[PDB]
C-alpha cells in the first residue's frame, strides 16, 4: 500500500535573469 509523508520546508529561491543583446549591422546604431 502507500503511506503519506509530509515535508514542509523553508526555502530561499535565489534566481536571476539573463539578457540576449544581439546588435544589427551597420555602424552599430541599431540593435
Amino acid at each position: 500500500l502507500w503511506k503519506e509523508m509530509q515535508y514542509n520546508r523553508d526555502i530561499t529561491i535565489r534566481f536571476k535573469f539573463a539578457s540576449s543583446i544581439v546588435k544589427s549591422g551597420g555602424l552599430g546604431y541599431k540593435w
Partner: protein, 276 residues
C-alpha cells in the same frame, strides 16, 4: 492441526489423572547445560562432563541425552545464542556490572521473538507496539537514533549529521533498544560489526531456564518499568564452588524441568524466528 487450531477443546473436570510422564519425558528428550568457561576452569577436570552424564543417568536420563555447551562469558554468549536441546538450562554467573546485559540475555532466551531485517540506510523505523523492540547483536554494536517529527525532520538531531544523533548503545554484543512508539527514527549502526532486527515478543519460551549463580534478583525481562516478573524458569542460587552448583543442578533436575515445558523447541536453534 492448523485447520483445527481455532477449534474448542472440551474437557470434563472429572477425567482421571494419568500416570507420571517425567520418566518417559526424560527417556524421549535431551538436556542442554550452558555454563561459563570459568566453571570448567575451576572444575579443572577433563572427564567432568562424563561424570555429570552418569549422575544425570542416575537421575533418569539415558546416556546420550545430556549435552554441555561452553560459552566464554555473558557478553560473547549474547551474540546469536543457540538453544539446541529440548530442555535448555543456562548457568549465568552474576556480575553486578552487567545487570542490563544479563537481563537482555534473559529477555532474548526466555521469550519467543519474531524478527525482520532492518536496512537502516534506506528506511526510517517505528516501534508499533510495546511488544516491538530492536534487537541488535554482533561483535560490537553502536546504535545512534534520531527521532523525526511529522515532517520527517530530526528532533534534537540533524538528520544528515550522525554526530548529533542520540547514543542508546555503544560497543554492545547484544542490545534490545526500545524507543517511543509511533515516532519515525533514523538509525545509524555499525552494520559491519553487528546486525539489527525489528523484533516482536510473542510470549514466553517455556523450554529455557536461566539459573543465576550468585547475586540478587536483578533480572528484568520486560521493558515495562512497572513490572519485573520472576517466572518459574528464572532461578537464583548462591555459590562458593562450581562443583556444588553442578551437583545442585543435577540433584534438582526434576524440579528444574518441572518448571519448563517441551513443545517449545524450534526447528532452528536460533533465539528468534526470522522473516526476510
Amino acid at each position: 492441526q492448523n485447520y483445527g487450531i481455532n477449534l474448542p477443546i472440551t474437557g470434563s473436570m472429572d477425567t482421571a489423572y494419568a500416570n507420571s510422564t517425567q520418566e518417559e519425558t526424560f527417556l524421549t528428550s535431551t538436556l542442554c547445560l550452558y555454563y561459563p568457561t570459568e566453571a570448567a576452569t575451576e572444575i579443572n577436570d577433563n572427564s567432568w562432563k562424563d561424570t555429570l552424564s552418569q549422575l544425570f543417568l542416575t537421575k533418569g536420563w539415558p546416556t546420550g541425552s545430556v549435552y554441555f555447551k561452553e560459552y566464554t562469558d555473558i557478553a560473547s554468549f549474547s551474540v546469536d545464542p543457540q538453544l539446541y536441546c529440548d530442555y535448555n538450562v543456562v548457568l549465568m554467573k552474576y556480575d553486578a556490572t552487567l545487570q542490563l546485559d544479563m537481563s537482555e540475555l534473559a529477555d532474548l532466551i526466555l521469550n519467543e521473538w519474531l524478527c525482520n531485517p532492518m536496512d537502516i540506510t534506506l528506511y526510517y523505523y517505528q516501534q508499533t507496539d510495546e511488544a516491538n523492540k530492536w534487537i541488535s547483536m554482533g561483535s560490537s554494536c553502536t546504535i545512534k537514533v534520531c527521532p523525526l517529527n511529522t515532517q520527517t525532520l530530526g528532533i534534537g538531531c540533524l538528520t544528515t549529521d550522525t554526530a548529533t544523533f542520540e547514543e542508546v548503545a555503544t560497543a554492545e554484543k547484544l542490545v534490545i533498544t526500545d524507543v517511543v512508539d509511533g515516532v519515525n527514527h533514523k538509525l545509524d549502526v555499525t552494520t559491519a560489526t553487528c546486525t539489527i532486527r525489528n523484533c516482536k515478543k510473542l510470549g514466553p519460551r517455556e523450554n529455557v531456564a536461566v539459573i543465576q549463580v550468585g547475586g540478587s534478583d536483578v533480572l528484568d525481562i520486560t521493558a515495562d518499568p512497572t513490572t519485573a516478573p520472576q517466572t518459574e524458569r528464572m532461578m537464583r542460587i548462591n555459590w562458593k564452588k562450581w562443583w556444588q552448583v553442578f551437583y545442585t543442578v543435577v540433584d534438582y533436575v526434576n524440579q528444574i524441568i518441572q518448571a519448563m515445558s517441551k513443545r517449545s523447541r524450534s526447528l532452528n536453534s536460533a533465539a528468534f524466528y526470522y522473516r526476510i
